[PDB]
């Protein structure tokens, strides 16, 4: 999940920043641009504290801008299959369970769960709650769940989680 992986980004820089603080402007622009991406594969980015090198500044012909190819190790936000991660829940719907990992809005289907857990709509907080309160799946509690699927829709990072395995949660 948290991989210290090199990431390549291209900086298009206006000539107004061709001053004594040119490279500082390059770094600031990279920090402002790269953060918060919701592309299908790479997703959210954590690379403020790390830079490998800044490539040479190639002046594009016919355009005032300049290309600064910057290499740097980065932390990616990508989906995967067949592994289980510590998770904390968010607001839960009636039949579908919404859990959250970082900013990623994970989802869980109803009948995929083992029968020791069932929804109780008569409960005051609408959330996945067991009758005996053995494990309560509600907002802001520690749980465990696996992820197998990947999802993209108009560059909105999405995924579906599963909890077919038992014994997971406060473990």
């Amino acid at each position: 999940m948290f991989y210290h992986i090199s990431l390549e980004h291209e900086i298009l820089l206006h000539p107004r920043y061709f001053g004594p603080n040119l490279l500082n402007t390059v770094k600031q622009k990279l920090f402002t641009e790269v953060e918060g991406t919701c592309t299908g594969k790479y997703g959210f980015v954590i690379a403020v504290t790390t830079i490998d090198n800044i490539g040479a500044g190639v002046i594009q012909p016919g355009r005032g801008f300049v290309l600064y190819p910057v290499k740097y190790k980065a932390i990616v936000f990508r989906p995967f299959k067949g592994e289980v991660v510590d998770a904390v829940v968010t607001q839960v719907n009636k039949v579908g369970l919404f859990t959250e990992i970082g900013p990623m809005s994970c989802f869980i289907s109803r009948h995929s769960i083992p029968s020791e857990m069932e929804f109780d709509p008569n409960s005051n907080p609408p959330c996945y709650k067991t009758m005996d309160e053995d494990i309560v799946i509600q907002q802001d509690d520690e749980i465990r769940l696996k992820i197998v699927g990947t999802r993209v829709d108009k560059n909105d990072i999405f995924a579906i989680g599963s909890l077919m395995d038992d014994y997971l949660g406060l473990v």
């Binding site: 299908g40 594969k41 012909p61 016919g62 108009k154 560059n155």
Partner: protein, 123 residues
Amino acid sequence: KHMVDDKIHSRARGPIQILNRQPMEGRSRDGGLRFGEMERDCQIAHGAAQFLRERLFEASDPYQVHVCNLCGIMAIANTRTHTYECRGCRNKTQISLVRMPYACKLLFQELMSMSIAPRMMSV
């Protein structure tokens, strides 16, 4: 019968041909002048490569198509829905916008119609 008033002509930006997007022909149709082959030869003789590039590509028929990086075929681009698909090699990510003359796109499309695959790559 020849006067200057029947021969003076100027054009900045106006109508274009339908098939290729280059400017039209003639001053009756307000078409602009042909930067012919020998003009290109004279401009490379100058070495004014930027002026030649502007005249041929930029001043006549600028265009840009999205092309897949794996196979050099132009990819479907839906810019407003912000998705770019190279349907044919199962690619949705390795898509690159490439600036070319409209006549070059036209030529490559007829070559594709002739079963030739003008696979263009940035590699």
